RNA sequence: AAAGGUGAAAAGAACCCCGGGAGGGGAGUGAAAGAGAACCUGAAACCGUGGACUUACAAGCAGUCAUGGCACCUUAUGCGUGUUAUGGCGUGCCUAUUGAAGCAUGAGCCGGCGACUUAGACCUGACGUGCGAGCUUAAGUUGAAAAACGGAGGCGGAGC
RNA sequence: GUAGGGGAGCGUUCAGUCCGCGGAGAAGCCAUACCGGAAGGAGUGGUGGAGCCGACUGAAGUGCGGAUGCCGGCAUGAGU
């Protein structure tokens, strides 16, 4: 049951997830997300093989006081590493129902406090970034909070550029992290809304 | 002093293991064992005829000690901290 | 707020680190440490010495449709091969 | 006082009677032996015993005993008739290394040490008690 | 990512080292030798801690029987006569009572005599 | 093969003093020369200098306990800290072992390097989540400060 | 209480979020008689000359006395 900026009422649609605001699922989801974005790149010459050394050394008996095969082994200095990082992935498939349930539960997790929907993104008048500050101020946003603006209308979002007030996630590119991480969610376009 | 007082100490604040009931000077009394006071020394069972009194001073926690244990060749080393609690009784009584 | 975001309460346990433990030098004592050869099957232990041949075929296999499903509930929707797709009998291949 | 930053600029931090010979190719252990008799005596006497003492180490210790008295007199406006060795001492130093030898275990046991200085020093001061 | 052993081993070793004071030579200076000394040090600490109570037990007895023998009893006799009087649970630290206070221990000796014959 | 670091800026130290020099001591510059070119911090082994309490009839894994002496009072006048004299007690660590102070292994000392991982639509268990008589997708496609789409297939669903 | 199984935890690096601190001085380094059941963590002091605690979650090249282990430095034998 949430109120739009310009025009009618709605949000009596969309029963919000049960039980209400489970943080466990949230956790599973975001963790899955940062693990998705995680880019494996690993510089290790782990193997005795990967660093360069000619391999026969001195002698197995009778030299006294050492017993080494090669100059490239892990127990040497400069050799390979025992069990070093390699280029893995850790990108998996999260069960879909928990993605849905996730961002739903996120939007819901904004129901215990401030969230906002909007119509008429024409109040910007090109962009100018200032008219966005106006729109925010008269909509109650002084940018003392952190704000995730979700909208279509390239001109309307292009108005908001800063890491201070806001951040922009267009055409319903909604990301559970991206919302839960910001202070206020401004849902604007009612498209993926309702 | 086995646990809990005895004997003769004239006008002295001292220490003892925890006193049960807490108090700031909640009064604690003790039946006797021996007395050298008055320059007349009479032994026990005549000390049931006497009782010293004491005021509880403060509830303390003693100086930290470590508990270290070792057995050789077997590994087995052990480190744990210990402080054994007390209360301080000020002694003036009959 | 992600700061406040908590764990699943028992999803993750920590792993197993065999560095330290002080009296951890893992696995056995002797004899069958260091190897990659363990391998729980193998030749003459009661697998061979076991007297079977039989004959392998494994031909046509039919999809089982219980009467118990069809009667009782739903509509008697006049099944054919059509509805089976949506009736939760959808598997195919057979 | 103020703070440490200010203590650094409010005071230049001098060194009375102090001079030191760095990097003299000699052995600390050795030079110690000379330097011991010098220590705590009349700076003149010190110059004499230093004149007649047969270790070659004694020479750069002598060259220094003066340079410190030198500093003591000129730089610190001190009074040479009250002058004496307050302290002197030998601190080792950067043991000398050449390009070679480099080889494992082949005719490999030899010195090539050519040990470090001992650094010398000798702080000088005025008698006090008289 | 890689986490070197930096700044960890050193704090640890200094912690070990610091217990060592009147520790003679490398015992107070080199790590391994110090830590190692602190193993046997563990043994003697704990065990001789339980022991010190045996030690003071010994001392006090050694005094009490002394005062006793001085007055004509002995520890066997004196403590016998003491216990023989339900009177004295005196027991603990009675030594100092014998050491500092002559006439008191004379009265305890005489009394314990009554409780014998 | 090892390999790096003045300073914000060379302002990189005229000039004086000891010396053949090296090297240092002043001066000056500089926030700093507690940065001076063997130029960021500067640990530990190891070498010295000064002080405190101590030691030249004492059998010793170097400690531990207990009391006394001397000295010091910035978590700190005691619940003390440092050192020490005497008493009591007291068979290094590790591995390997029926059994280790071992006259059995290892190791001069300190620093740093240094060993139970990783991969697969594998298998089987414990816990946890989501849906639940149903549960999932794979390659890929499309977006890509973002994720959605993708039912080819897999597992339940009947045993012999 | 040894191999072995089970439970709670301490510390280090990177990462996201939160609170923040720093030239009237960061980390590191040095001394210390305090706290904590232990891994440990604070307080003040001394160095230092730029950066860095704490909380919550996540990921490890994550914890050394030994391997006649590796590199380096410095001892002994000895002023022999
Ligand atoms: Mg073994
Ligand atoms: Mg065996
Ligand atoms: Mg430097
Ligand atoms: Mg070991
Ligand atoms: Mg010889
Ligand atoms: Mg000879």
Curated annotation (Swiss-Prot), chain A:
InterPro entries: Ribosomal_uL4, Ribosomal_uL4-like, Ribosomal_uL4_dom_sf. Signal peptide: none annotated. Keywords: Ribonucleoprotein, Ribosomal protein, RNA-binding, rRNA-binding. GO terms for biological process: translation. One of its GO terms (molecular function) is rRNA binding. One of its GO terms (cellular component) is ribosome. It holds the Pfam family Ribosomal_L4. Transmembrane segments: none annotated. Belongs to the universal ribosomal protein uL4 family. Part of the 50S ribosomal subunit. Contacts proteins L15 and L34. One of the primary rRNA binding proteins, this protein initially binds near the 5'-end of the 23S rRNA. It is important during the early stages of 50S assembly. Makes multiple contacts with different domains of the 23S rRNA in the assembled 50S subunit. PANTHER family: 50S RIBOSOMAL PROTEIN L4, LARGE RIBOSOMAL SUBUNIT PROTEIN UL4M. This is Large ribosomal subunit protein uL4. The lineage of its organism: Bacteria, Thermotogati, Deinococcota, Deinococci, Deinococcales.
From Swiss-Prot, chain B:
Pfam families: Ribosomal_L21p. GO terms for molecular function: rRNA binding; structural constituent of ribosome. Binds directly to 23S rRNA, probably serving to organize its structure. Belongs to the bacterial ribosomal protein bL21 family. Part of the 50S ribosomal subunit. Contacts proteins L15 and L20. NCBIfam families: L21. HAMAP family: Ribosomal_bL21. This is Large ribosomal subunit protein bL21. It comes from Deinococcus radiodurans (strain ATCC 13939 / DSM 20539 / JCM 16871 / CCUG 27074 / LMG 4051 / NBRC 15346 / NCIMB 9279 / VKM B-1422 / R1). The gene is rplU.
Curated annotation (Swiss-Prot), chain C:
Keywords: Ribonucleoprotein, Ribosomal protein, RNA-binding, rRNA-binding. GO terms for biological process: translation. GO terms for molecular function: rRNA binding; structural constituent of ribosome. The keyword RNA-binding applies. Residues 1-38 are annotated as: Disordered. GO terms for cellular component: cytosolic large ribosomal subunit. Part of the 50S ribosomal subunit. Contacts proteins L4, L21 and L35. Belongs to the universal ribosomal protein uL15 family. Binds to the 23S rRNA. This is Large ribosomal subunit protein uL15. It comes from Deinococcus radiodurans (strain ATCC 13939 / DSM 20539 / JCM 16871 / CCUG 27074 / LMG 4051 / NBRC 15346 / NCIMB 9279 / VKM B-1422 / R1). The gene is rplO. The chain holds residues 11 to 104 of 156 of the full protein.
Curated annotation (Swiss-Prot), chain E:
Keywords: Ribonucleoprotein, Ribosomal protein, RNA-binding, rRNA-binding. Part of the 50S ribosomal subunit. Contacts proteins L13 and L21. NCBIfam families: rplT_bact. One of its GO terms (cellular component) is cytosolic large ribosomal subunit. Coiled coil: none annotated. CDD domains: Ribosomal_L20. GO terms for biological process: ribosomal large subunit assembly; translation. GO terms for molecular function: rRNA binding; structural constituent of ribosome. Binds directly to 23S rRNA, probably serving to organize its structure. HAMAP family: Ribosomal_bL20. It comes from the Bacteria. Belongs to the bacterial ribosomal protein bL20 family. This is Large ribosomal subunit protein bL20. The gene is rplT.
